[PDB]
Swiss-Prot record, chains A, B:
Active site: E16 (proton donor/acceptor), D25 (proton donor/acceptor)
Main location: host cell
Keyword Hydrolase annotated: yes
GO molecular function: lysozyme activity
Family as reported in the entry's similarity comment: Belongs to the glycosyl hydrolase 24 family.
The name this protein goes by in its record: Endolysin
Pfam families: Phage_lysozyme
Record's GO cellular component terms: host cell cytoplasm
Tree of life domain: Viruses
Length: 146, 146
């Protein structure tokens, strides 16, 4: 089955931000790497923990399994790697349920790939800002179409 | 049999670089994926060939057969999966002959595992820079000791 590429990982890290020192996120959840909140080598993330970029990649691939599974489950048409990598980035952000209900998905499964790419741009709001995710969506759309 | 793990493949792809569109290496050899120069789907690698990340990983797993075979034929002591994955990365780089004559091998076969790990750091020179591979060797050593 398909898998995220090295370029896909690099681009996703850029979009998400990578933090090699543990921190408490805006909700209070200990986090490290690229959004990793689960255990790291058998222990909970905690103040003072540091990891390498390569460990951060390892953890991110573990945390992307639900994303890759969702694409495998939901998408029934061919994807090139750039399309796949872009979708990984979108889905990692908006979540599986949002993607399952999305125009991106519906258009993809009709093989309207340009329309699916354009539908990335709908996923632009966060909180009280109607367009804060639009620059990310544009970069993902560009990758999808590349 | 022991074989490279998915973690081992990810880490090796990081060290080597992945190209999903065919290119000519610095010597002029058509290459794709992670150092693949043989045919892909029955055709010679050539300008215009594209592949997926899944393909790239499956090609790499097959291209590593000489590495896996070198470990089986030369290493006389047990290896855990992290050790194995780190060895694959070193050997894929320096080649079978270099590994056969190495301090890494000698120390490994004496069951001097820490000294074997440390001896990775000897394989640091390339061209006119005496340490340019040292960061890679340190990362592989860290994987070995993990
Ligand atoms: Mg063999
Ligand atoms: Sm396959
Ligand atoms: Sm899985
Ligand atoms: Sm705004």
């Amino acid at each position: 089955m398909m898998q995220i590429s090295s370029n896909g990982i690099t681009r996703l890290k850029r979009e998400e931000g990578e933090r090699l020192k543990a921190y408490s996120d805006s909700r209070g959840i200990p986090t490290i790497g690229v959004g990793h909140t689960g255990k790291v080598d058998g222990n909970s993330v905690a103040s003072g923990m540091t990891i390498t970029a390569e460990k951060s990649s390892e953890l991110l691939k573990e945390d992307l399994q639900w994303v890759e599974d969702a694409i495998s489950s939901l998408v029934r048409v061919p994807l090139n790697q750039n399309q796949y990598d872009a979708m990984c980035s979108l889905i990692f952000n908006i979540g599986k349920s949002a993607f399952a209900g999305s125009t991106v998905l519906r258009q993809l499964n009709l093989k309207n790939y340009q329309a699916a790419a354009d539908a990335f741009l709908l996923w632009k709001k966060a909180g009280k800002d109607p367009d804060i995710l639009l620059p990310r969506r544009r970069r993902e759309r560009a990758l999808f179409l590349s």
